[PDB]
Design a binder for this molecule. Structure first.
Ligand code: FZC
Ligand code: CA
Ligand code: CA
Ligand code: CA
Length: 312
């Protein structure tokens, strides 16, 4: 597929990452010094850490799980597949280990945080910026399914990471069933077919992307749909079980009219079709008018991001 083709800068950055990764070796707990907390989520807390021997900065997720040695060793072995997941749209992997009752997963550090954190600072994320995000998510989901036969299964703003170089990468995609079962995470982004028991596919991840795009475009979780008074304040309390019933039984959310392009509205509409068979697939989204316009658009995402969250 032509979408998995890499630019020259992408190929250089991937090769540089792999070159620095080869110099690391077996990760051990005492080789890390904590710098700051990047946030909690998906069963653990993530810290920005320094790997003292190599000097690299990493993101370290610690999942407190009291498990027998055998259980931990299968998880660490199942997570070894992440060494082969190398893509400009997937966060890079360093290693996994067990120490004093906590599983550690050490990955590439994205100094822009997650898009749920960016959204809180920005209020709303512009359409041209969301075009770049859509391209990255589509290509990331394509790489995972095409090169590894993996579904992400948890697309949401907090699982999309960005950095000051303009890169946009996915994270928190399951690869270890033992780790999943051992943990025993919000379902507010799950497709109505997954919430109804009907088995999952990449179409479920496409629903989650469309819902995430709508939330970032309007600045609020779009379910329940906003009132006209909320819209006039935006452009000029359901419990969790009630919310999940709303997703299955009510029409999907949509962007407001007049403030977004029709190509963007049509793009998220084809993502949020409740029937997974009528919902667009990755191949069709890759050639959608909104995506073709966005790829031709020359958006300084890094410049927008650094000024929005104040990286400087
Ligand atoms: C592929 C895979 C399979 C199984 N398990 C895991 O475990 C993980 C998952 C994710 C990270 C992770 C999180 C990061 O921010 C979090 C902040 C709070 C909300 C969260 N949704 C994102 C960052 C940042 C900013 N830069 N790099 C990061 C890496 C790590 Cl380290 C290990 N991964
Ligand atoms: Ca420790
Ligand atoms: Ca220790
Ligand atoms: Ca997970």
């Amino acid at each position: 597929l032509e979408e998995l083709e890499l630019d020259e800068q992408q190929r250089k950055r991937l090769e540089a990452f792999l070159t620095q990764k080869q110099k690391v070796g077996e990760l051990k707990d005492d080789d890390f010094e904590k710098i700051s907390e990047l946030g909690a989520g998906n069963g653990g807390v993530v810290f920005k850490v320094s790997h003292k021997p190599s000097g690299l900065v990493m993101a370290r997720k610690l999942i407190h799980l009291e498990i027998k040695p055998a259980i931990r060793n299968q998880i660490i072995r199942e997570l070894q597949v992440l060494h082969e997941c190398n893509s400009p749209y997937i966060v890079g992997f360093y290693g996994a280990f067990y120490s004093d009752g906590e599983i550690s997963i050490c990955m590439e550090h994205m100094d822009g945080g997650s898009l749920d954190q960016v959204l809180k600072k920005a209020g709303r994320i512009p359409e041209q910026i969301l075009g770049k995000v859509s391209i990255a998510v589509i290509k990331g989901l394509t790489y995972l399914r095409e090169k590894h036969k993996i579904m992400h299964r948890d697309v949401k703003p907090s699982n999309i990471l960005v950095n000051s170089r303009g890169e946009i990468k996915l994270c928190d995609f399951g690869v270890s069933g033992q780790l999943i079962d051992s943990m025993a995470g919000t379902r507010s982004y799950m497709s109505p077919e997954r919430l109804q028991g009907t088995h999952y596919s990449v179409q479920s991840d496409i629903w989650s992307m469309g819902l995430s795009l709508v939330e970032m475009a309007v600045g609020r979780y779009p379910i329940p749909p906003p009132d006209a008074k909320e819209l006039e304040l935006m452009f000029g309390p359901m419990a969790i079980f009630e919310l999940l019933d709303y997703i299955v039984n009510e029409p999907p959310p949509k962007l407001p009219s007049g403030v977004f392009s029709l190509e963007f509205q049509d793009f998220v509409n084809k993502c949020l079709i409740k029937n997974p068979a009528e919902r667009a697939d990755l191949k069709q989204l890759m050639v959608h008018a909104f995506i073709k316009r966005s790829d031709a658009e020359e958006v300084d995402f890094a410049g927008w991001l650094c000024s929005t969250i104040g990286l400087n």
